[PDB]
Amino acid sequence: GVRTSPTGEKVTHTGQAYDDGDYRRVRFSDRQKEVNENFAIDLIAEQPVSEVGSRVISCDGGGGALGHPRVYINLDKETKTGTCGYCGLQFRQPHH
Amino acid sequence: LGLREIRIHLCQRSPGSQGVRDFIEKRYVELKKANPDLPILIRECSDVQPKLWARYAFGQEKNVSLNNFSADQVTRTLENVLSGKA
Amino acid sequence: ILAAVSNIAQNIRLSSGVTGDWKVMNILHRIASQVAALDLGYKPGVEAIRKNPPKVLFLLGADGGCITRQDLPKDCFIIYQGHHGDVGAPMADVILPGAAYTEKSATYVNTEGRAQQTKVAVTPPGLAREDWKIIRALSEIAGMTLPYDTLDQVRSRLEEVSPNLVRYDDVEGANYFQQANELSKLVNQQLLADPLVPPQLTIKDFYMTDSISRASQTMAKCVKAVTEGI
Amino acid sequence: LHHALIPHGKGGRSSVSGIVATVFGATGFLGRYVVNHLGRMGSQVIVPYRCEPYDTMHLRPMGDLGQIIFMEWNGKDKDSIRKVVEHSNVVINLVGREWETKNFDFEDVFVKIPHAIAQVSKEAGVEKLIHISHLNADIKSPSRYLRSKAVGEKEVRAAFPEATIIKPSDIFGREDRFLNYFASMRWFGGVPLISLGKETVKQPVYIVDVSKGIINAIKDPDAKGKTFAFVGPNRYLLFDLVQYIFAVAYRPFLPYPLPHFAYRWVGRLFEVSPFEPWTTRDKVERVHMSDMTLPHLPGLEDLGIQATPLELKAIEVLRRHRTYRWLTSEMEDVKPAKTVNI
Amino acid sequence: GTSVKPIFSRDMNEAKRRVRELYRAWYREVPNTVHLFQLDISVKQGRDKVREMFMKNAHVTDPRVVDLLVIKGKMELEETINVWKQRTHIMRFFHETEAPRPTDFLSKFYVGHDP
Amino acid sequence: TRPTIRPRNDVVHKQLSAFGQYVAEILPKYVQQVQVSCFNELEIFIHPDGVIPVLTFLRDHTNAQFKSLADLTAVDVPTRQNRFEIVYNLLSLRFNSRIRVKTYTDELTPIESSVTVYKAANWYEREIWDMFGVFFANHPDLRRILTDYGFEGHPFRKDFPLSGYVELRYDDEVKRVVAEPVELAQEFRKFDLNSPWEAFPAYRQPPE
Amino acid sequence: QLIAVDEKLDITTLTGVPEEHIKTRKVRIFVPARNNMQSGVNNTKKWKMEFDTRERWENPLMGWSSTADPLSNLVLTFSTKEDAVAFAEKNGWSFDVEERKVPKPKSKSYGANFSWNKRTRVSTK
């Protein structure tokens, strides 16, 4: 989800845009600013939380050797989901 | 024109400062009683030399070597500097 | 209070005798620049400014708010030289940007009296300059130029004023306790019937103390955490 | 100071000087030197060009990565002028042409374009504007070139009150049309000089001096609304100047006097060419006119520049015009010409 | 004593005579260099440059260092005579593209962060 | 120990040790030390004054006849009084062997040129003169070989900076390639890689 | 065949270093302190010579860190303090030397954790 600053310049996923008082805008005159519109922070929020009937789950990112190093995520906390430190996938336990 | 500060740099264990040390351990207090508002900064020295610094109006400054001076010579030098001399 | 503590130390010394080189009396400072300023002959406190209000005021990183414009006459030319915009900056007529402790090779004296030197890690932002260089440039502009041009030369002058400021790890000193004790007995100011309460009552008063601390978001987070647990 | 434009570094190629300059007419004789001097410091240079981009490639190596930015523009379209000066704090104007084309006249390049540049710069908030006029610019001058120069000077001053106006005189250099122009007349056998060139006094200035003066005027804080006159250190009669020029190039000097009307007719004949003319009637008028003396205006010495005399830089221009036999002659071999000073 | 080994000279007199012969050679060679490389400088300028280059090392008192400097000067002269150097290498001695770096305190204070 | 460890040859070790015995015995005046490494390489450390004798012996003696000069280089160790360590690698085709002779010098002491012993040294010594600044006495033509004409300094010294002091660019005003003080768009990033735990206890030094 | 030179050794004229990088530079000779994030002490064995930090600015393009100091990455390694001092003296550099710091020997005792009357007894183990 890319937005536009009041200057009229696209704001990157890092949230940077040249100020109205910044001369460096001239490098985009008659040219374009390269902005990627697939914001990873927005794309990972759309992933549903996974409910698993175990206290400890394992995540390798999917794909086996094509993912990330295999890690183990604990699910004792009930007020918060278990997040993978590599992939951003969320895991929890059946509740309520 | 007038005296603003006096600085005595004495070398703590050097023999050449012995007399100066004597002054500090005998006749400094009386001097500070005679001059309640005169800064007299007693500072530590290197292995080099004992000296006495006198500062006057508008940042004029002159020094006197106190090497091997006896306590009487040191107090005479302070009397000369405090008076309108040297 | 200083007279009373010196009297206690005198009683200890004249009762137990001269145990050797023990130096019972101690003063615990909390300001990094206080001991060096005292060594250079500065007058501690701001009593002189209140006694004789000046027309030109040099605020060399002074942000304690001890002197405000109500304490000074009108058309007073206040000059601030520092690195943070804080208590002392908006009241200034001219602001001179200086370097912080991480941006200069500068000397600070310990509460022990030990002199140490910092090193340049980064360079001052924008047009900020080293403080002694600012003062030297100002002296040259005014025509009353100072006799030193490099850092080694200003440190030679510093040695001239107080030689202990160039010995960068030596803490050895000479004890002159009896002279100061004798001199403290002349005046006899009476104590005040007010309990001794430190300004640092709890942990929440510790995080923000100087201009750098007040400008830090981490210290603000720490204060917000210690005021309410959550 | 929009801190991205605070100086940083040692004033080298990779350093930042806080200068963002739009150099109109940067593809000319003076423009290449101005751009080179700007890029040496580490300045952000905007080059507006209308020619083929090939003709700008000699400006590529003059700055660090991203420091020189080329954009197209039209002299008659103010939108392009606005587009190229939006983010600049300095606008240098060097647009000019020694001859009139079918699309642009002297008033178009010396009055209309400078006025449009100044007006757009004032509207866009440009702080510093440097404008280049001629030392001999007069409203009642016999040449259209200088009348247009004077009118443009007035109009630029009206549109941009704080503009710095620089009036040089007969810049000489490797790519000039002053030393090369006189040297190239050897191809006609004789050198036509009106009144044998004894009634005309010239004070030519070096190109590097002009470029350094422009740079110093950019960096000078008190040169806002001042007008400067960049002249050389010596004044010579046209005859002595051309004699010295031919002596440096080791070519036989055969000067003859030509009447003003006939040599004007020759200029009219040469004007007809659809390419860069070899000479024109306006060039005729400007060549046979004495350089003005303006003792009330500041010069190069006010900007810290010491003018370079012709005798130390003539060899670097006129060695190309020598034959093989004289190609290795030294600079100390020409015995400089006579100067009528004071 | 320091027990040091010579290169060519035993004392400063031999080193000085070697310096003098090298200076003679450079002084003789300068006009030929100006003509061959088609330099725009004068012969007097080139001889001033040679003199300045020699005088930069006037403070050396070690005969060994003086001998090594003379050896390096002979290599430079050999490169110049054989036209192994180009015009750029000869003209690098004059620093015509470097703006004058100021020396006084105020100019350094005004320009940058370093002395 | 079998698969992933380099096998040891003790026959060559004993042969090289015996030849070090032989060389050290024949030339006591110059040979200062003889070493044999655990991968069967023989080193002889000699006084500099013996560069020409020892080498000649190793070339001309019937039992040695090291008739090939493989390489001649220098190493800079700034912590030593004699800064530069000169290394000669010789090859004997008759006995199919290799030997190393090392000597030392500093910035001001010259070393006898070995071009008379080995014609191959002519360029090698020049490189040592070019890169390290070691002067070689009695060289037929000693000059720079690898650096640019008029280049000041000797880059292979440890105190010489990686990027040097000057850089070249073409200037249009003077119409030539000129040299200016070096400036970098991006500074070389220095990495502190050494681990705070020692790896090899066999090389531990006295505790100072 | 010796000449017996007297004065101090100085090779500044033979190094090709510009004057501004000799007379204005200040080197530090020191033993680097142990990184407190680790307990190993292998990096506290040798002496080091480094130079004073100079200005670093940011590139107008891409925002990288640009420098103009050629000696900003030069660190030299020495066995003893006097070796580094001699190197600096013969190279014409002004130096500051910091004397080596070593952790003083400490008296440790496991039994002190369980003292009968001293304050040393530990609350938890």
Ligand SMILES: NC(=O)C1=CN([C@@H]2O[C@H](COP(=O)(O)OP(=O)(O)OC[C@H]3O[C@@H](n4cnc5c(N)ncnc54)[C@H](OP(=O)(O)O)[C@@H]3O)[C@@H](O)[C@H]2O)C=CC1
């Ligand atoms: N004798 C001298 O040289 C001195 C010069 N004068 C003034 O100095 C200025 C620059 O001098 P100089 O460099 O020698 O002149 P040049 O002819 O060499 O170049 C002038 C610049 O102006 C541009 N230009 C010319 N005509 C037009 C146009 N109709 N529309 C848009 N741009 C145009 C040219 O671009 P392009 O190449 O693409 O056509 C060119 O880049 C001029 O204003 C001149 O009048 C001041 C005193 C004398």
Ligand SMILES: [Zn+2]
């Ligand atoms: Zn994962």
